[PDB]
Write an enzyme that holds these catalytic residues in place. Structure first.
Site: not given
Ligand SMILES: Nc1ncnc2c1ncn2[C@@H]1O[C@H](COP(=O)(O)OP(=O)(O)OP(O)(O)=S)[C@@H](O)[C@H]1O
Length: 272
Positions: A12, A17, A32, A86-87, A130, A132
């Site tokens: 993201g 992740v 993550k 894990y999803v 948050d 979205k």
């Molecule tokens: N529990 C999970 N299982 C599988 N994929 C995941 C999981 N969590 C996150 N992801 C993947 O990683 C991506 C980014 O995770 P986020 O937690 O949304 O990252 P982030 O960069 O901290 O968030 P923002 O909202 O973009 S700043 C997700 O859109 C998924 O594609």
């Protein structure tokens, strides 16, 4: 030694992740960490550390469980991390960008499940903040999974505000934020999964924030075929500018969604 790292799953604005195997329990987990390219940016480093430290650990079928957080000792230095459920699936953002709007009944089912997750969270004193499309996943087996619960911040970057497409008017203005903010943002998601577009777009977050505060959303049925006035009433109630006019709880919003799914009139004010 506990985790065997597998493939990268996604990224993201801040984080990357990875899939891992937990060799103690023999379960897949998602790990993550800070994006490798942002890891030495002070703003992102500070944000990630605080969100890992304050990561919401909730036990609910529609919430991604957080199993562990901390700072792993590594040669390169202490590594902030989150280990979670894990999803196997995709985000609503992926679905909209790849498959287009959902059919109305499916959209209602997905957002109804999201309301249950949020109500559970709200019951345990936690506001998401948050909500979205990127923070809601649908698994390969069609289960809704809400994730990445936000945290309370200081009152006046690091990708906290992106487009502002999903912020509530109260968040844009720095007012008090409560569970009704999540209702609004969930309303924006519902709007987008029904129509393919968020209710407000613009060239900057300032322009979008303005629209959230000042401009009425176009009813969904005026933007995409196959929708109904009863679904319009529910979406426009969730998106009321004044929280006093919104669904006061996520359960209240869910109740009206369930009514529309069943072909019953919603309690939301009728829209012509
Ligand atoms: N529990 C999970 N299982 C599988 N994929 C995941 C999981 N969590 C996150 N992801 C993947 O990683 C991506 C980014 O995770 P986020 O937690 O949304 O990252 P982030 O960069 O901290 O968030 P923002 O909202 O973009 S700043 C997700 O859109 C998924 O594609």
């Amino acid at each position: 030694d506990r985790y065997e790292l597998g493939e990268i799953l996604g990224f993201g604005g801040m984080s990357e992740v990875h899939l891992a195997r937990d060799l103690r329990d023999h379960r897949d987990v998602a790990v993550k960490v800070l994006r490798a390219d942002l890891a030495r940016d002070p703003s992102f480093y500070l944000r990630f550390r605080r969100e890992a430290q304050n990561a919401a650990a909730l036990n609910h079928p529609a919430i991604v469980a957080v199993y562990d957080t901390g700072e792993a000792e590594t040669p390169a230095g202490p590594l902030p991390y989150i280990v979670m459920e894990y999803v196997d699936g995709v985000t609503l953002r992926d679905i909209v960008h790849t498959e287009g709007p959902m059919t109305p009944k499916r959209a209602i089912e997905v957002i109804a499940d999201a309301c249950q997750a949020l109500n559970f969270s709200h019951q345990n004193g936690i506001i998401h903040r948050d909500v979205k499309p990127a923070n809601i996943m649908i698994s390969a087996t069609n289960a809704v999974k809400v994730m990445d619960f936000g945290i309370a911040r200081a009152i006046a970057t690091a990708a906290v505000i992106g487009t502002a497409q999903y912020l509530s008017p109260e968040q844009a203005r720095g007012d008090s934020v409560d569970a009704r903010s999540d209702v609004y943002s969930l309303g924006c998601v519902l709007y987008e999964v029904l129509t393919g577009e968020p209710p407000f777009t613009g060239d900057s977050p300032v322009s979008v924030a303005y629209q959230h505060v000042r401009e009425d959303p176009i009813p969904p049925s005026a933007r995409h075929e196959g929708l109904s006035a009863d679904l319009d009433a529910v979406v426009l109630k969730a998106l009321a500018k004044n929280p006093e006019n919104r669904y006061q709880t996520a359960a209240e919003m869910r109740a009206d969604l369930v009514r529309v799914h069943n072909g019953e009139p919603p309690e939301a004010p009728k829209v012509l």
